[PDB]
Structures are given as structure tokens and as C-alpha cells.
Amino acid sequence: LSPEQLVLTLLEAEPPNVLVSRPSMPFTEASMMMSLTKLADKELVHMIGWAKKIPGFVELSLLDQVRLLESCWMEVLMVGLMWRSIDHPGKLIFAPDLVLDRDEGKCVEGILEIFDMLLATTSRFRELKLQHKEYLCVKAMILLNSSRKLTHLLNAVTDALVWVIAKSGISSQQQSVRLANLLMLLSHVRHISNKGMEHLLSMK
């Protein structure tokens, strides 16, 4: 498979959006957590089908498959949330009809800071002018950077990210730099996922 072809299959593998909605009345700690939780449940179902569409993922052992989805699922969700909210300052686009204002974060104890960390990282991706095609490779690298067919798969995604950056036309050095900047941003997603998780544990 060529890089371009790898990208095209990732593009077609995007999960469908989820059918949700904001309760008409003002959010409460209960209804906001109820909404986020139902949303994630449906996204988690679609995430499994998405990973199965990544070229070579189903050829991995069932155990490795489950292992990857299990250890980086909050990260895959957050980066999708960031991509969706990239062009909307102060807003988190959890789902097409589940758009939350930053200030709504005070509706839940301790979610405000997590919202703020998501908004900041999203702003960095915006400043970097992240492209939708680079978002697809970066998302697949989060799921896979955790040995043999796996390393092969990661390499393929990496060559697909490099091909996408080459098509932007900047210089060779600026292409390396851009690569380094995209990858260093994923470690920020890792950090916010760890805090979001602890935020969940203490909560439920």
C-alpha cells in the first residue's frame, strides 16, 4: 500500500458521528456527566470498528488488539475532540449537537481545568495549522505507538505522515521540524488523558 493509499483508507475509516443532544434546561453536574458518558460509550463502539479498518490491525493478535485500544482510548477520544474544536475558540465540540461553552465547565467539580487543558492544546494545534490529513495519521500513531507486525504498521503510518507533510511544499528542514512539532504535541494529549482519567476515578 502506498502512503497516499494508506491515507485514503484512514479517511474512509473515520467513524460516523453519534446521535446526541443537549438537555434543554441548563446543565447540572448530573446531566453533564450523563451526556459525556453516553457520548463516550457510543464513541467507544465506533472506535473499535475504526481500529479494525486500519490496514494490518486485524492481522495483529487479538490480545495485542485489545491491549492497544485499552491503553490509549482516552487519548484517541481527546485528539478527535481537539480536531473537532480546532476552529472554535473557547468551545469544546464533543459532538455535532453537543457543543459546550468553556464556562459550562463550572457545572461539574474539577472539569473546568480539564476543559482548559483541552482548549489550550487545541489552540496549539490551531496555531500549527494542523491539517485534517495529518490529523488522521497522528490519531492512528497514538493507537499504535505502545512487536513485529506492529512495528511494521507504525512505520507505514509514519511514512504516511511524512508523505502528507512533503505535499505541503515547505523545505526539507521545515518538514522535519513540522514532524517533530506534531509528535511533541501528542505527548501533551497523553498528559491530559492521564488527568482526565484521574478526574474520572475520583468522581465515579
Ligand X SMILES: CCCCN(C)C(=O)CCCCCCCCCC[C@@H]1Cc2cc(O)ccc2[C@H]2CC[C@]3(C)[C@@H](O)CC[C@H]3[C@H]12
In the complex, minimum distance from the CB of residue 27 to Ni ion, in angstroms, rounded to a whole number: 22
Pick what 73 binds: its own copies, ligand X, Ni ion, none; C-beta below 5 to 8 Å, kind-dependent: ligand X
In the complex, minimum distance from the CB of residue 180 to Ni ion, in angstroms, rounded to a whole number: 27
- Rounded to 5 degrees, what are φ and ψ at 57? -65, -45
Number of residues that bind ligand X (CB under 6 A): 21
Pick from 107, 189, 177, 178: nearest CA to 145: 189
Cβ proximity to Ni ion, 59 vs 87, nearer residue: 87
SS3 of residue 57 by DSSP: coil
41 makes contact with Ni ion (CB under 5 A):
no
CB-CB neighbours of 172 under 10 Å: 8
In the complex, minimum distance from the CB of residue 92 to ligand X, in angstroms, rounded to a whole number: 8
Which region among 22-30, 40-48, 93-101, 183-191 touches its own copies (by CB under 8 A)?
183-191
Beta carbons within 8 Å of 99's beta carbon, 6+ residues apart: 22, 91, 92, 93
Pick from 11, 34, 44, 58: which binds ligand X (CB under 6 A)?
A: 44
Number of residues that bind its own copies (CB under 8 A): 23
Pick what 149 binds: its own copies, Ni ion, ligand X, none; C-beta below 5 to 8 Å, kind-dependent: none
48 makes contact with ligand X (CB under 6 A):
yes
Cβ proximity to ligand X, 104 vs 158, nearer residue: 104
Give the DSSP letter string of 81-125: HHHHHTT-TTEEEEETTEEEEGGGGGGSTTHHHHHHHHHHHHHHH
Report the C-alpha gap between 92 and 58 in whole angstroms. 32
Point out which residues bind ligand X (CB under 6 A): 36-37, 39-40, 43-44, 47-48, 69-70, 73, 77-78, 80-81, 94, 111, 114, 196, 199-200
